Amino acid sequence: KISTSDPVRQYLHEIGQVPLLTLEEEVELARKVEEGMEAIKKLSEITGLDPDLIREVVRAKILGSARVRHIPGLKETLDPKTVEEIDQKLKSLPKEHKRYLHIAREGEAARQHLIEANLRLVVSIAKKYTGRGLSFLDLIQEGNQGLIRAVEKFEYKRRFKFSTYATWWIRQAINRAIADQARTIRIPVHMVETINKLSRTARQLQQELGREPTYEEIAEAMGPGWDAKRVEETLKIAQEPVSLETPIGDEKDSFYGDFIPDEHLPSPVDAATQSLLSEELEKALSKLSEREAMVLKLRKGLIDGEEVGAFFGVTRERIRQIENKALRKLKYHESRTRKLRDFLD
Amino acid sequence: RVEYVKKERAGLRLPLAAWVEKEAYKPGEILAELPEPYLFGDKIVAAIDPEEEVIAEAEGVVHLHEPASILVVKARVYPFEDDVEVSTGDRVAPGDVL
């Protein structure tokens, strides 16, 4: 039964049950997030294990077993053996070093209780950026992709509040997704900030003139390197692919697509020309001294058409030689037996 | 399990305000730290501090509440060794096999 509410609800359910203290607890978790990486960074030292390892293995010990490591990203690492093994070394580390394992673990745990206490902090924000071209959910989803990305970076020591800090990164993440997923034909961020201007300028001109601006009014208005061919060209692209499937004519049954022809496929009269062309050129291929014919033959023919590095051994002057001569003899033995004359093309 | 404290004393509490008064982190004055009952392990004066922070000066402030949260779970402290199945629990300090 209709999504949206469930999530909006599921959030408030653990949000409405797990809100965070405006300072304290947030500052608490924070210290436990930073002392986390810092910790792990030392584990890697005392263990010659890549940070990427510790970070993962510590996460599973908390988030999920060997289950979440299998289906997500294939068995590169031993769901069973490899993971416990690593942990074995961590727990085997003397008090002085194991200290950090517990801190690491206690570290990632805090991250957990800092990302949730704001899932609504995202929703609110998302509430604004909406009708651009993404479900409310996605808009919220891409907002959370930003919430976390904002935790990895917050420095609690620099007294300024978290909530805020999150705002920035969140909007950052939503926009990207917007610019990057919004359409069917990928357009760059560049030619995006630029289309909006044009959409806008289109209105400023709608404002006073009355005549829907010619690609001149718009061009002058926009800026420098803006011609008339430019704006006209900018829009066809700023368009929206029309559904290959849409009611046409006295719309009833007749579906659009059936009005669009084909081209790759040669229609019977052409499939018959390659027939005649092939054989006839191939019959007029034999009445030749293969020593040079078969070089231009396959040249345009087989691979691709460069006269220089053309022939195997012999130099150039013998290329054109038999070329220009064979070609011509080839041209007049056909003038007689008129086969290609009436251009098969 | 009570959390962030304020200021009334400091009996058997956390390692946070162990710096606010070096006495018990370089020397050993906590034993004489009591205001006056020494003539006629955590503790502290009537009230000489705020909340949680790094006190080189106030570079880690957090003036607030004291959430006393109850977690329905069992609290062990001095577990030992019963080697029938793989080592479970911990020791008084040594191998915290967990």
Side-chain angles (χ1 to χ4, degrees), chain B residues 18-32:
Chain B
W19 287 107
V20 302
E21 54 173 351
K22 308 280 268 59
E23 299 86 288
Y25 225 158
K26 226 101 299 176
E29 300 282 76
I30 178 185
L31 189 67

Side-chain angles (χ1 to χ4, degrees), chain A residues 13-162:
Chain A
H13 271 285
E14 285 192 58
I15 293 179
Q17 278 192 186
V18 196
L20 280 186
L21 190 290
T22 306
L23 268 185
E24 222 313 294
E25 313 173 302
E26 280 213 296
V27 177
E28 173 181 353
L29 286 167
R31 188 206 317 154
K32 301 199 105 294
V33 180
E34 204 185 72
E35 185 50 301
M37 166 218 73
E38 270 189 52
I40 301 190
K41 274 220 170 183
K42 264 185 175 177
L43 285 175
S44 52
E45 286 190 54
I46 323 162
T47 325
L49 260 63
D50 299 303
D52 21 293
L53 274 47
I54 313 307
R55 164 179 295 86
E56 275 289 332
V57 183
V58 161
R59 282 186 181 165
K61 279 288 132 61
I62 318 300
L63 44 60
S65 44
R67 46 180 176 59
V68 70
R69 288 178 120 283
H70 177 291
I71 306 181
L74 301 173
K75 54 159 280 57
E76 238 291 62
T77 62
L78 298 158
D79 356 302
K81 219 65 186 176
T82 298
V83 295
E84 300 174 52
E85 293 178 70
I86 296 175
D87 194 305
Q88 294 168 52
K89 293 191 176 174
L90 283 170
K91 64 183 181 188
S92 64
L93 288 167
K95 274 298 198 74
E96 324 97 68
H97 309 305
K98 178 131 181 182
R99 180 235 300 213
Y100 301 72
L101 202 197
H102 291 254
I103 288 178
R105 307 293 216 73
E106 298 272 52
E108 256 290 308
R111 165 146 178 282
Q112 296 297 300
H113 295 308
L114 215 194
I115 304 179
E116 319 186 72
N118 297 257
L119 239 172
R120 192 175 65 170
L121 187 296
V122 182
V123 184
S124 58
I125 306 178
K127 216 65 187 185
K128 276 83 174 195
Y129 296 74
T130 304
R132 285 195 191 182
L134 291 169
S135 306
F136 188 61
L137 308 151
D138 295 59
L139 299 173
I140 297 183
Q141 276 305 75
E142 289 287 43
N144 297 322
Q145 175 60 46
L147 190 121
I148 309 177
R149 192 184 301 177
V151 170
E152 173 174 333
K153 292 294 179 294
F154 185 46
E155 304 184 63
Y156 99 118
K157 284 176 293 184
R158 286 175 193 178
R159 213 55 230 184
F160 48 70
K161 137 83 85 175
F162 176 74

Side-chain angles (χ1 to χ4, degrees), chain A residues 268-279:
Chain A
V269 181
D270 292 307
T273 294
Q274 265 66 313
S275 178
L276 218 166
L277 206 82
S278 176
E279 292 186 55

Side-chain angles (χ1 to χ4, degrees), chain A residues 203-216:
Chain A
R203 311 156 196 161
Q204 304 171 58
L205 282 181
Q206 166 48 53
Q207 169 250 43
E208 190 70 302
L209 207 300
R211 289 175 171 180
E212 304 179 295
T214 186
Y215 298 132
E216 273 75 50

